[PDB]
Structure 1
C-alpha cells in the first residue's frame, strides 16, 4: 500500500483477539538483530514460511483469516531461532547488530562480526548462511577476501575480536 498523505492521525485498538484464535508470542526483536538473524531464520523456517505463503495464495483473498495457524508456526520458529541465539551466541550477535546500527544497516560494514557469528551458529546450531540463486561459478559477496566496498571505519570491538579469534584459532 501507499504511505499516508497530507494528514493522518494514528489510532490504536484496545480490543483483544477472538477466543477461537489461540494466543501466540511475538518476535520482539528490532530492525538490526532481525537483519542479523534473517539468514538463520531462513535456513530453519523455509517450509513453514512457504506453507504460509502458499496458503495465502490458495485462499485468494481470505489469507488474513485462513493463514493464522501457519503464521503462528512461522512466528514460533523465528522465536526459537532467536532464543537459541540469545541462549548460546549473544556476544557475537550483539557485535553484529551494533555494528549494523553504526552503519546504515549495510552488511558490508560488518563482515568481521558476521564471520564470528556464522562460525558460532554453524558449530552450535548447525545453521549456515547461503545466498541462493547463484551458480557454482559466482562468489558470494560475504565470502570475498578483498572487496571493493569497505566501511569508512571498521568497528572497533569487532576488529579486536577478529584479531583475538585469529590468534586463538577459532576462525
Structure 2
C-alpha cells in the first residue's frame, strides 16, 4: 500500500510540490508534569527480529496498555500515558538483554532481514540460532497463537517457499552449530 496521505512521507517530491507540504518540527518537550521516559532506539530490522521476544516478555503490559486504550472511550492518548511508559521500558529491557546475552545471534538475524527484504521466510537459519540462544539464556520462546504447536511455520522442516539467495554468514554459523552442539 503506497497511498498518499497527509500523515507521513509521500512517494515523491512532486507530490510535496502539488500539496505544498511543510515538514514541521516542534522544539518543545513534554511538560514536566509527565514523567520522562527513554525511547526505544532500535530500527526496523532489530524490531522485527525481536518482535516475538517483546511479545513474550511484555505480554501483560502490552495487553494492559491496549485495554487502557479501549476503556478510555476516546481519551486514550492522554489517559494511558502511564501504561504507555511501562511498555516502552519493558520493550527496552528485552533489547538490552539481547545486546548482553545474544548479541552475536541477534545481530546475525536482523542483518539477514536487511539482506532479504525483511522477510521471515528468508532467515530461518539465523532465526533458529537466535531462538535457541534466547530460550537458553532468557527462557523466552517464540509462539504463534491460534494454531497447534507443531503447525508453526517457523518450525517447519521443509517449507515450500525458501530464500533465493543464501546468507553466507547464516550458512557458516548454522554449520558451526550443527557439528558442535549436536555431536
Return closer, same or farther for 1:170/1:89 CA change in 2, 3 Å cut-off: farther
Equivalent residue, structure 2, for 1:3: 5
Alignment of 1:52-71 (within 5 A): 52-71=65-84
Q: CA RMSD in A?
A: 1.5
1:36-87 CA-partner distances (Å, limit 9, x unpaired):
0000000011111111111111111111110011000000000000000001
Question: How far apart are the structure 1 equivalents of 2:65 and 2:135?
Answer: 26
SS in 2 for 1:10: strand
SS in 1 for 2:41: coil
Structure 1 segments unaligned to the other structure (5+ residues): none
Does 1:156 pair with 2:168? Answer: yes
Per chain length, whose mean CA-contact separation is higher, i.e. which structure has more relative contact order (CA < 8 Å, sep 6+)? Answer: 1
Equivalent residue, structure 1, for 2:12: none
Structure 2 segments unaligned to the other structure (5+ residues): 7-14
**TM-score (normalizing by structure 1):** 0.94
Question: How far apart are the structure 2 equivalents of 1:126 and 1:25?
Answer: 25
Equivalent residue, structure 2, for 1:143: 155
**TM-score (normalizing by structure 2):** 0.88
Question: How far apart are the structure 1 equivalents of 2:85 and 2:41?
Answer: 14
